[PDB]
Design an enzyme around this catalytic site. Structure first.
Site: not given
Ligand code: HEM
Ligand SMILES: N[C@H](c1ccccc1)c1ccccc1Cn1c(=S)[nH]c(=O)c2[nH]ccc21
Ligand SMILES: [Ca+2]
Ligand SMILES: [Cl-]
Ligand SMILES: *[C@@H]1O[C@H](CO[C@@H]2O[C@@H](C)[C@@H](O)[C@@H](O)[C@@H]2O)[C@@H](O[C@@H]2O[C@H](CO)[C@@H](O[C@@H]3O[C@H](CO)[C@@H](O)[C@H](O[C@H]4O[C@H](CO)[C@@H](O)[C@H](O)[C@@H]4O)[C@@H]3O)[C@H](O)[C@H]2NC(C)=O)[C@H](O)[C@H]1NC(C)=O
Ligand SMILES: *[C@@H]1O[C@H](CO)[C@@H](O)[C@H](O)[C@H]1NC(C)=O
Ligand SMILES: *[C@@H]1O[C@H](CO)[C@@H](O)[C@H](O)[C@H]1NC(C)=O
Ligand SMILES: OC[C@H]1O[C@@H](O)[C@@H](O)[C@@H](O)[C@@H]1O
Ligand SMILES: [Cl-]
Ligand SMILES: [Cl-]
Ligand SMILES: [Cl-]
Lengths: 104, 464
Positions: A94-96
């Site tokens: 997801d992060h790629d």
């Molecule tokens: C330890 C595992 C995981 C987290 C801790 C975690 C946390 C988040 C958070 C806080 C968000 C953003 C929340 C918001 O909308 O305000 C978030 C976004 C996304 N995730 Fe999460 N995630 C954990 C693990 C996963 C796994 C295993 C995923 C998929 C197989 C997964 C996907 C995603 C995606 C696609 C997003 C949106 C990212 C973006 O910003 O575009 N996550 N996750």
């Molecule tokens: N503001 C977040 C924070 C979390 C803890 C304390 C202070 C502040 C944050 C910080 C650094 C990187 C990402 C995030 C949020 N974040 C995370 S953790 N995961 C996603 O997939 C994501 N997508 C958009 C946003 C975001």
């Molecule tokens: Ca990429």
């Molecule tokens: Cl994350």
């Protein structure tokens, strides 16, 4: 774009030669369906008190979580056919692909 | 400030609290929420859209970065070896760690005040969110550097730039191979795999490779796989004392644990030898993310499932039935029809009580609610959204590993031998790993083999 190359750019620019920002970083997502906002263009559903979505009250995300998602951890079912590495690859993958920025 | 206030003013959209909430007794309180940045701020013409800060391509941008300044800073420019910069203060039993970042408000520093270990710096800003994630990031940092070293021995004339680019190209292809060969069939199941991801033919420059707004929410299906603990195991795959099962609310942004509690080897073994959590219609997501998400770095614990639903509204995403229609799937209207789609009338009733209509069910909620496809971990709707996206990222990528001219035939043949257990063997002190498929295998010693039985990547065809 340079007529010939050997490697990808860091931003993703020039991967598609005809429309060179496609898949490139710091660009708007593509919409597979038109957006649905409370005012039609920017306000999210749940923003304005009393404004219903398609004839019904907007359900608080927290109330949906409490009523549907919440479960006793003692009942957790381990996946016999998946390792925790399967969950972990999903997040790394997801992060790629996508990061939706927010103001700090 | 959306983290400290409950005022609904730009750029905040706080989650309101329902009456009789099992945690938040004051309905005047909220769950923090910042609206995603708009593509066109302040516009009275545009329909609000969100931005993707990253390259949509499966190009390992979480390792290398998606912007030129960051990509430069992630590299070791002190020589011509084409290596990525490593931590200058700590090592994991003599092995590389990600360098630390310099954050204005560093959340890692808050997880253990006394350890004073900041967040890590990688290609993506979320590398420290969980130590298990940091470990995968560390593994790939080491793989790049290991490839660059072996490439230098094979091609002594090659400069730093050439070595970095050639090692980056291999890493990207390894991420593409593990994703499409090992990961995606186990997500979709064989039926949806055949339908949405047919055998690759070649690059098509008319396939839009952008991430769809819906995908950022649909792919969060993985939150249903999250176990409530971080599991650490020693060289015998036995609980590593005194903290084998650390609650997830105590590991978020806890980079101090990688640095001071045994490095990435116990974490990787825990990931390999522990089962994922199974998504069930009455067991969707754990309270470690539902009640205690970021408990140590926020004024209150966040609710990840509720954040997902609020996010889909923030992004103006259509509801469940509109996505069912897009995917050519039937649109239930009645509680009976929803009961049939879900093969669960009890859940259909709860969804109807909450939303009033199936048209309004949030995409993540509807998507994770669906019964799972055979040998898959998603229902029909998520399989359609995920499969469609990954087909576009593959067919729309000019640098796809199988695209003609990207690699030579001898290089492609060599790359088809790679696997994630082999990368673990080459970059850690772990000598016993999961049998293929790593994403299925989860029981030690049954699904485990020693590293000596796995062939290494043959770089012979990279010799110039
Ligand atoms: C330890 C595992 C995981 C987290 C801790 C975690 C946390 C988040 C958070 C806080 C968000 C953003 C929340 C918001 O909308 O305000 C978030 C976004 C996304 N995730 Fe999460 N995630 C954990 C693990 C996963 C796994 C295993 C995923 C998929 C197989 C997964 C996907 C995603 C995606 C696609 C997003 C949106 C990212 C973006 O910003 O575009 N996550 N996750
Ligand atoms: N503001 C977040 C924070 C979390 C803890 C304390 C202070 C502040 C944050 C910080 C650094 C990187 C990402 C995030 C949020 N974040 C995370 S953790 N995961 C996603 O997939 C994501 N997508 C958009 C946003 C975001
Ligand atoms: Ca990429
Ligand atoms: Cl994350
Ligand atoms: C290269 O890729 C593009 C895009 O591919 C599309 O996305 C992929 C991710 C994947 O889902 C693909 O299957 C998908 O096509 C291809 O170009 C598309 O090609 C189709 C078929 O030609 C087009 O669909 C057409 O849309 C017309 C709208 O003006 C419509 O009139 C057509 O339908 C009518 O005609 C047919 C034939 O007579 C009939 O069967 C129908 O019932 C109807 O009367 C038709 O649906 C897409 O619009 C094209 N998309 C783009 C972006 O151009 C391309 O073909 C592919 N090339 C190769 C060689 O693979
Ligand atoms: C760069 O590489 C050299 C040689 O491996 C190493 O000693 C040095 O610490 C590296 N520098 C950085 C900033 O990573
Ligand atoms: C904080 O880190 C130190 C190591 O610097 C460790 O000894 C201590 O136990 C940690 N605190 C907690 C509560 O685990
Ligand atoms: O663009 C996403 C989808 O849209 C609709 C159809 O045209 C599909 O073939 C396509 O995959
Ligand atoms: Cl969309
Ligand atoms: Cl450092
Ligand atoms: Cl081991």
């Amino acid at each position: 774009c340079p007529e010939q190359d050997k490697y990808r750019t860091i931003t993703g620019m020039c991967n598609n030669r005809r429309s060179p920002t496609l898949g490139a970083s710091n660009r708007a997502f593509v919409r597979w369906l038109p957006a649905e906002y409370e005012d039609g263009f920017s306000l999210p559903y749940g923003w304005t008190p009393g404004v219903k979505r398609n004839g019904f009250p907007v359900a608080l995300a927290r109330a949906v979580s409490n009523e549907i998602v919440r479960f006793p951890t003692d009942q957790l079912t381990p996946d016999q056919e998946r390792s925790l590495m399967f969950m972990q690859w999903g997040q790394l993958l997801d992060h790629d692909l996508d990061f939706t920025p927010e103001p700090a | 400030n959306c983290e400290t206030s409950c005022v609904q003013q730009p750029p905040c959209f706080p989650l309101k609290i329902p009456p009789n909430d099992p945690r938040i007794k004051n309905q005047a309180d909220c769950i923090p929420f910042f609206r995603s940045c708009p593509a066109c701020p302040g516009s009275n013409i545009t329909i609000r859209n969100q931005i993707n800060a990253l390259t949509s391509f499966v190009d390992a941008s979480m390792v290398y970065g998606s912007e030129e300044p960051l990509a430069r800073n992630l590299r070791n420019m002190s020589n011509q070896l084409g290596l990525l910069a490593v931590n200058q203060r700590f090592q994991d039993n003599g092995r590389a760690l990600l360098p630390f970042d310099n954050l204005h408000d560093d959340p890692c520093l808050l997880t253990n005040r006394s350890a004073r270990i900041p967040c890590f710096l990688a290609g993506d800003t979320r590398s420290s969110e969980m130590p298990e994630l940091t470990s995968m990031h560390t593994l790939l940092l080491r793989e790049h550097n290991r490839l660059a070293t072996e490439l230098k021995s094979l091609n002594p004339r090659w400069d730093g730039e050439r070595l970095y680019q050639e090692a980056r190209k291999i890493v990207g292809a390894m991420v593409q191979i593990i994703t499409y060969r090992d990961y995606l069939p186990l997500v979709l199941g064989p039926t949806a795999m055949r339908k949405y991801l047919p055998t690759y033919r070649s690059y098509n420059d008319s396939v839009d490779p952008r991430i769809a707004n819906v995908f950022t929410n649909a792919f969060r299906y993985g939150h249903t796989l999250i176990q409530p603990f971080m599991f650490r195991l020693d060289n015998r795959y036995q609980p590593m004392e005194p903290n084998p099962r650390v609650p997830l609310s105590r590991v978020f942004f806890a980079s101090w644990r990688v640095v001071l509690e045994g490095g990435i080897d116990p974490i990787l073994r825990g990931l390999m030898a522990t089962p994922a959590k199974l998504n069930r219609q009455n067991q969707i997501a754990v309270d470690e993310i539902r009640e205690r998400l970021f408990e140590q770095v926020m004024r209150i614990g966040l609710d990840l499932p509720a954040l997902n639903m609020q996010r889909s509204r923030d992004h103006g995403l259509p509801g469940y039935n509109a996505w069912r229609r897009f995917c050519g799937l039937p649109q239930p209207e009645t509680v009976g029809q929803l009961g049939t789609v879900l093969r669960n009338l009890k859940l259909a009733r709860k969804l109807m009580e909450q939303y009033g209509t199936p048209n309004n069910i949030d995409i993540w909620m509807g998507g994770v609610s669906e019964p799972l496809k055979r040998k898959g971990r998603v229902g029909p709707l998520l399989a359609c959204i995920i499969g469609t996206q990954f087909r576009k990222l593959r067919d729309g990528d000019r640098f796809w590993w199988e695209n003609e001219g990207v690699f030579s035939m001898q290089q492609r043949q060599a790359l088809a031998q790679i696997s994630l257990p082999r990368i673990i063997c080459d970059n850690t002190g772990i000598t016993t790993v999961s049998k293929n498929n790593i994403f299925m295998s989860n029981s030690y010693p049954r699904d485990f083999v020693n590293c000596s039985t796995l062939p290494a990547l043959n770089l012979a065809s990279w010799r110039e």
